[PDB]
Design an enzyme around this catalytic site. Structure first.
Site, PDB file in Angstrom:
ATOM      1  CB  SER A 152      22.147  41.560  22.357  1.00 13.83           C
ATOM      2  OG  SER A 152      21.243  42.608  21.974  1.00 13.83           O
TER       3      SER A 152
ATOM      4  CG  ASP B 135      36.387  41.044  35.988  1.00 16.39           C
ATOM      5  OD1 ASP B 135      35.592  40.937  35.246  1.00 16.39           O
ATOM      6  OD2 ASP B 135      37.793  40.639  35.742  1.00 16.39           O
TER       7      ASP B 135
END
Length: 330
Positions: A199, A35
């Site tokens: 992004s 994770d």
């Protein structure tokens, strides 16, 4: 040193991925959920409330000659779905794919919430976010990666998740045969303890690319892709019959649909998520309404590049002095 381990979807929907981990002496092998959005290594154990264990493999520290109780230490964590777990702490030897750390904090669960109990395939979590998020008190502990780093050939790990198929986590090296083209690296902020990056935009299907900054986290422990409502609306508007359902808890679409791809930007590079990756199947057994793999982050507080996005790429988690993230197509 290096390590290399195969990671395998827990079910036919890629709801999560499990990776075998050796704990203790002799080795006790548990299947953990790696994770990158948390920083605790915790396991089902011989200390876990018996009624809360249902099929998981447990760590029994009394059977490990290298286990030592970390005196006074406790832990307690909550996850994005509202699941939680807590307990006490041992140090022990932990190996992943041939890479060994001695004195790793292994957090032994005394309590786990229903969601964990009900998932027989996940024996615990192995956190790979920054150690500043680790919940051990009163002395915060380091992640497996943090402990291994100095010994690694290169201070990196890579995630290569499969679509309906196994993949690989590598530590300490970049497998140049595992991706196509080049790796594009992008800046990371560690201020919130996550692999947080920005992004450069998105496209829906064969549509034109929209240049827009989307701050979010690279999170192998989240199943879906969570993005701003504007972006998500634009995606689902291209699927006939798709709608946001409050009763179901997100966007659903007719299972008869053919889904468009979704592209996200990494600098000047582009990662294309095929439409099939965005199908999470019937909302309930036998239903013709299917759950979407792109959902709104509104009310999460952060955008999350979860498995839906990450499995479309070869991803480098670069833990150099100034961390960065790398993405390649594959």
């Amino acid at each position: 040193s290096t390590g290399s381990a195969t990671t395998t979807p827990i079910d036919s929907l890629d709801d999560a991925y499990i990776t075998p981990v050796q704990i203790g002496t002799p080795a006790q092998t548990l299947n953990l959920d790696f994770d990158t959005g948390s920083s605790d290594l915790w396991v089902f154990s011989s200390e876990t409330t018996a009624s809360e264990v249902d099929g998981q493999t447990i760590y029994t520290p009394s059977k490990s000659t290298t286990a030592k109780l970390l005196s006074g230490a406790t832990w307690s964590i909550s996850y994005g779905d509202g699941s939680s777990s807590s307990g006490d702490v041992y140090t022990d030897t932990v190996s992943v794919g041939g890479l060994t750390v001695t004195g790793q904090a292994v957090e032994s669960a005394k309590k786990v919430s229903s969601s964990f109990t009900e998932d027989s395939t996940i024996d615990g979590l192995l956190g790979l976010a920054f150690s500043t998020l680790n919940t051990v008190s009163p002395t915060q502990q380091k992640t497996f990666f943090d402990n291994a780093k100095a010994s690694l050939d290169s201070p990196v790990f890579t995630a290569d998740l499969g679509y309906h198929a196994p993949g690989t986590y590598n530590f300490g090296f970049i497998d140049t045969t595992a991706y196509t083209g080049s790796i594009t690296y992008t800046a990371v902020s560690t201020k919130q303890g996550f692999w947080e990056w920005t992004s450069t935009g998105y496209a829906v299907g064969s549509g034109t690319f929209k240049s827009t900054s989307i701050d979010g986290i690279a999170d192998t422990g989240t199943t879906l892709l969570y993005l701003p409502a504007t972006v998500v609306s634009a995606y689902w508007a291209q699927v006939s019959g798709a709608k946001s359902s409050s009763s179901v808890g997100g966007y659903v679409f007719p299972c008869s649909a053919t889904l468009p791809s979704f592209t996200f930007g990494v600098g000047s590079a582009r990662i294309v998520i095929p439409g099939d990756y965005i199908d999470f199947g019937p909302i309930s057994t036998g239903s013709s309404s299917c759950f979407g793999g792109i959902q709104s982050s509104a009310g999460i507080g952060i955008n999350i590049f979860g498995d839906v996005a990450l499995k479309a790429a070869f991803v480098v988690f670069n833990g150099a002095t100034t961390p960065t993230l790398g993405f390649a197509s594959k």
